[PDB]
Write a protein that binds this ligand. Structure first.
Ligand SMILES: NC(=O)NCCC(=O)O
Lengths: 222, 222
């Protein structure tokens, strides 16, 4: 399949490709979730959910593996690292709970509403649902092994946040020799709008390719 | 030692830290080098070079290990990966040489002027000079081993490009549990100025800390 993209069109085989849905949890996409409580704007993520539903339907019907990521930790945050880990000091979820103690245990905690995939996005049999303890899906996980075991070399990225978990996973994919394509209208940034523009610029210019959901779905039709 | 930084000050032991000078080669810093020929603005790097000189002098006097990265490949580009590698398709150096065959074998080529560190920056005995074949200094290199062997947990980053090799190495450092600081006035982006602002925003907000050369040097002065 040829897929129109920036900076140029690319070729991939859907049977040797994977659609990655990054962290489409209430924490990242739903009012009252972690990102909203931490002061990030989540008022614009509703269209992202619908676009991911469309991309997922197309990808699955074309024989692409669907991988869903859930970012987060045990309710006691052992998996987040203690003060000896930079994640303890950088995590805005941990920072939010140190500021608002009534939140403690509620954000990015396995078994919590915050941690669940949003109600609209339901993994199907044959999909893979992967937890991850840090922003990049390629550290501390079996993601690379899962992809290699299926001979997958092309990754189609969707999800939140474009500049954080999405871009980090795509960048690390590039260093592991994966060809990464981000569907720009199926992503949303954490931060001001320039963080979306800059993430896509960095991907298009240095690390991978940028397309969109409709173009992706049209390319998969045959 | 305390280092004033954004979003807050951090503490570290300079003798358990490293100053990383990312890719201060003519390719990235000098008119007529790779980035300039590829269409990126390199006209404002003279203050970056001077500031890196100041930071290196302070770090070495404080007992901090200095690591210099040189990015590039053999002059036949075997190390850049063939058409089976995304690096072959993304590399702007390779793209430039495809358009300009006069430059074939010169950009980012070991032994060449483009690959040499800029004239002003001269590694000293005791420093480590590390070649790397991809943007991130943590993939395909002994960098992690070098740092662990010395018990180093804090990395102070300088160099080019802020949004590419610098940020990628810092992000990967974070995933390997290193505490990363970038000295903003000792870096320069590849792309429009929004790429500098966004790289610093992503680092400060999610991955590490942002400081500057004079603050860094004053922290080491005791
Ligand atoms: N911004 C940047 O690091 N470009 C280098 C990419 C290449 O190796 O061609």
């Amino acid at each position: 399949t040829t897929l129109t993209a920036r900076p140029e069109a690319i070729t991939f085989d859907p049977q040797q490709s994977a659609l990655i849905v990054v962290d489409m949890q209430n924490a990242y996409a739903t009012p009252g979730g972690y990102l909203d409580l931490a002061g990030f704007d989540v008022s614009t993520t509703r269209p992202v959910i619908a676009n991911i539903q469309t991309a997922v339907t197309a990808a699955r019907a074309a024989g692409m593996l669907i991988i869903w990521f859930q970012n987060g930790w045990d309710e006691q945050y052992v998996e987040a690292g203690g003060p000896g880990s930079p994640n303890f000091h950088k995590s805005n979820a941990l920072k939010t709970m140190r500021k608002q103690p009534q939140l403690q245990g509620k954000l990015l905690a396995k078994g919590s509403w915050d941690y669940q995939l949003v109600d609209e996005l339901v993994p199907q049999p044959g999909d893979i649902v992967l937890p991850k303890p840090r922003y990049s899906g390629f550290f501390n996980t079996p993601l690379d092994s899962i992809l290699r075991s299926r001979g997958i070399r092309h990754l189609v990225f969707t999800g939140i946040a474009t500049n954080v978990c999405v871009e980090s996973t795509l960048r690390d994919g590039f260093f592991l020799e994966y060809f990464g394509v981000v569907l720009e209208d199926a992503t949303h940034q954490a931060g001001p709008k320039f963080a979306q523009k800059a993430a896509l610029f960095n991907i298009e210019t240095f690390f991978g390719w940028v397309s969109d959901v409709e173009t992706f779905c049209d390319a998969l039709s045959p």
